[PDB]
Every structure is written in C-alpha cells, then in structure tokens.
Amino acid sequence: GKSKKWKEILKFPHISQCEDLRRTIDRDYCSLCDKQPIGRLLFRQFCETRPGLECYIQFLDSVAEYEVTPDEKLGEKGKEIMTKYLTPKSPVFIAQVGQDLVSQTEEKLLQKPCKELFSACAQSVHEYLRGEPFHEYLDSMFFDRFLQWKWLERQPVTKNTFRQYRVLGKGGFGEVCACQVRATGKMYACKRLEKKRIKKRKGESMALNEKQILEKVNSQFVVNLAYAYETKDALCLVLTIMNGGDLKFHIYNMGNPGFEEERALFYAAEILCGLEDLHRENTVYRNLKPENILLDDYGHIRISDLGLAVKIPEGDLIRGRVGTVGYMAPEVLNNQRYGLSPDYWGLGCLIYEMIEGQSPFRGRKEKVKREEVDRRVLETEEVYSHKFSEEAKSICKMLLTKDAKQRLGCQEEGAAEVKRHPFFRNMNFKRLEAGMLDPPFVPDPRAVYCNLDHTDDDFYSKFSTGSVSIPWQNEMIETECFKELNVFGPNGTLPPDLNRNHP
C-alpha cells in the first residue's frame, strides 16, 4: 500500500545533485559492492553488461548455493560447479583463477566434499573484481545510479514520512506503536520515547546508547533499526516489526508448558546467532529472558529490548547489577567486572526453560522470595529431567557454569565453541543463517498472541540521525520500489536523470 505519488517522493535526483556525494563516499569495494544491498545489485548489474564479468557473478551465486546444500548432495553440486565454471573448455570459464588452483579444487573433490570447497576460488574471484572491474564500475552509469539512491537515502526523515497506526505494546520512557512508510508501504514498529520523561529521568545517555547499538548491528536474529527521527514531543525509533508473539507466551500458553527438544533446538540456534552478531560489536545484551525473544510472521525469532545492552571496550570489563530476577548470571548478582559471559548464562536459562517448561532455579508452581532465587543461582546446582537428551543436559550445564571463566562460549573462541556443542550436532548453521530451515511454528496472519534548553538540542542531533543505510536499502528492495524505479534508457543507453547534458 504505497502512497499515490510515491514515484514523486522517491524520484531520482539529477546526477548533477550528487557531486558532493561522489567526492565523500569512500570507494570501498566490500561496502559498495557487497555490504550495501543496492550497491551490491547495481555492481552485479554492471557485470551483467560485460561478457567477461558475467561468468564471475554466476559462479559466486553457485558457490553460495553450494554452501547451503545438504551433505549427501555436496559431491553432486560440486561436480556441477566444476564442469561449468572451472573447466578451461567451458563457455563461462573463470580464467582469473590460476591453473594451479582449478587443479586443487579437482583434488579436494577426489578427497571428500567439504562445504568450503570453493572458498579459495571465490576469494580469488573477489580478488579480481576488487581491481579493474570495480574501478570501471565506479565510472559507469550504475555507480551514478547508486549515487542517486544514496541521495534519496540521505533525505531527511520526519513524522510525515510514516503513517502511525495502533499502539501495539508499552514499556518504559514511552510505548511501542506500529507505523508504515507511506512511500513504500513497509510496516515497522515505532518506539516513541517521550522527551519530557527522558529529561526528568536523566537517562539521555541510555536512550542514545540503545539507538547506536541498534543501528550498528545488523542481524537476522536481532531487531534492526531503520530510522531514528525526532518529533516535537518524543524521540522515535523505527524497529523491525514482530507480529508472531514472544517466546514466553509460546512456552507457557501454547506449550506443554515447554517445547520438544528439537523445537527448542531451533530457537536456541537462532538466539545463539543473534548473540554472536551482538558480540561481534563487543556488545553484551544482559537481558535474555523468554518475553524478549519475539517471533515474526514466518516463525523466526529476533532478540528485542536492547535497552540494557552496552558496548564493551575491547580489552575491558564492565560493572552493572542489571536485568530481571532469575535471569542474572552470578557475576552480575555479585556486581563484578564481567564481559559477554552474562549472555551465555542467559542462553542456558532459555534452553532449560524451553525444554523443561520452568526456570532452572524457580519452579512454575513455586512461590519463593527474590533472595532465595539468587541463593539458588549462586549455590544450587540445577537438576534435569528425561525431557533433556544427554547433549541437552550437557550444553545447559556448561552454559549455567557458575564460574564465568569455565562457562561455555566465554573463552577467546566465543560463540563458535557453542556451535560445535553436541547439542547442535544435527544443526546446519549455514542453512539456518541463510533462512533455509523451516521454523517449527508458523503464526497465523490473523492472530493476536497477546524544556527549551540548548543542551537538549545537542542531544537530539546526535540521536535523530535519520535512516539507517542497510535497512533502508533493504526496505527499497523488499517493497519492489528499487525494481520499479531502477530503469535505464532503452538498449543500454543513458536515461535523462543520468545525463549531465540536459537536466
């Protein structure tokens, strides 16, 4: 449901308007041709016009397909890629991989199919495209078209950019609504934070820290920030909409209470990936409880409520007795210097609670004081039942290690150590990261699973930074605004908006 004149709102500016962008955007290959979705598509499209570059894009696609193929179907897919791209007789043969590398992948196959068989090749292909082909693209009409898309991306964002609907959720500093971009029709979840409630409460550094954390991370398993704008009365955060309910509701109201181990395996895998993406920015979550794990329309989960998250300086630790009773690691309850370890304790709490249907230190039918819940977390060893496989008991016992030094995933290796745990032995993380594994529960679409100071003006400028690059470009592609607007001249000629002669 796009606006009536959405083609006028996203109307491409004349290429002459982007000269300032041309001389400020860093010409980074990985950023302009891979990370940024629209730049990626435009660079691919530029390679579509060259017969030599074409075969290199098709191969990377075929390797991406190879990485997610089942194990019993690797050798089949591997031989296909070989006899189509890496055969010197082929029509779409890759010539920029040395003859002493095509030979190696032929041996690798003879040995045994490995899911990274073409990793060496793919890297050589990128080693070639980052050179000449990339610098030719920079002087092509497709990079000028990219500058036009960046220009639109940079445009200011106000309340009139969105269409507010219904108040779906509440909390602290404000409420959570559901908004829609008028020009594209994509649904989001506004997080209206009332300004008066932030000044009176002197928590401006907490709201800015949450926005910066939300924008810096992009993950399929954490709520993403798309826009940050100020409105006269509140400071809004536009986040991923999640309409499938939260994990607490599904554990207890839809559960046994609890899930089958296999079903909990799926959610734990996605949660673990969410934590790994957060930890890549050395950011600790500290708020892992079932009601913060939300489900989307398809049944996948994202981590939500990053208001308790903080960015840990590399090589440093932090203090903070924060979180929810029952979901605080011992090092947090003791108010010690900790790192990312609280999140792996939380992950243990979640896996246990999903399988067993209750918290590892508080029975569902038990009524105990906050103090006794902490004593158990610090002294009592949790007990397991026949709902847990030996592998499930293991990973939970290791993640619930009282000593953060011996806790799983809390070594220099990080989330990788948790992904090898026998509990995930039947989990293909590559296919999960690529969205190829069907969720165990698909929500029904029609479901309802539920003052004039200047220092304030300086705090609003650092917050209301506008649209977020990657989410915005993804919004354009998903809504098919990119497909419809990204048109050129007939027979590969310059369109008017890209011709500097007549503006």
Ligand SMILES: Cc1[nH]c(/C=C2\C(=O)N=C3CC=C(C(=O)N[C@H](C)c4ccc(F)cc4)C=C32)c(C)c1NC(=O)c1ccco1
């Ligand atoms: C559209 C919609 N959006 C949300 C909330 C979210 C969403 O999507 N994505 C995030 C990210 C992050 C948060 C978050 O910070 N939460 C904490 C506590 C918080 C903090 C401060 C506040 F002022 C308020 C809340 C919330 C959300 C919900 C729950 C729904 N509707 C349903 O799920 C639903 C449909 C039918 C039956 O139920």
